[PDB]
Amino acid sequence: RAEVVFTCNGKAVGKMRNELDVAMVKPFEERFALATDEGASAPPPLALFIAGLTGCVMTQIRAFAKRLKVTVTDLDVECRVVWDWAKAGPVYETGPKSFEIDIILHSPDPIEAQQALIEAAKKGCFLEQTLGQANTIRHRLKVGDTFIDA
Amino acid sequence: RAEVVFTCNGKAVGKMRNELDVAMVKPFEERFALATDEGASAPPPLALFIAGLTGCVMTQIRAFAKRLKVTVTDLDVECRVVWDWAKAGPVYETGPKSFEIDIILHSPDPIEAQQALIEAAKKGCFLEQTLGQANTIRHRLKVGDTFIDA
């Protein structure tokens, strides 16, 4: 199994800002400091993906906590995603292997209440709900003035 | 159908750098300039996701083009993703609605060759292969020194 492994350790700061410490772990080790927020050399694509997923989960936890009667302090979310690849003639093909999200709430509330918040956050999180089902991506290729299926 | 809609227009620059012009379109309009690369106020989580997806696709196109005998110039990739939400008691639940990726190669090669490159890029793209299947995300909640399922 040739693997690509990313992790993200997210920490809640400010009102809605999440500071996302992303690392490639395999095939080699690199770190990227990213962030998300709500209100109003570049990293590799999988770093943006894992930061997005971690930030999405964190955002829903933070948005829903008071509504669901949970006090959360110094929220930390740790996410690990594993993919694998295989040779396919002159190129490679890929797929997902595992997704893990560990959540630290520092909450004074019942565990049942904390679980309700995590469940609500899972269903509120656009990206989690996307990842939980198969999706069809329509691809098209420009030819002249038109786009054909590709 | 209450929708959340993001777009990304990606442009290839440099050797592997992709400049990703992301917009929220619904529920309101915001723009974010992002980028990915390979070698060696913060945006919302869905902006990082769509930038990641667009950058992943572009990276595979660029990595595979010469290997598959395709000349690509001034690569541009346009991606549109639509989700929807619905009320669920005191909170909301979400899901994916549509994914569209339009590719502009400016290539002097046969259309069949360009399609082979796009197909190879689809299978090489970690994120496309992730999105094409259902995934299980294991969630855990810290309790004391241990993590329980959540």
TrEMBL record, chains A, B:
Protein name: OsmC-like protein
Organism superkingdom: Bacteria
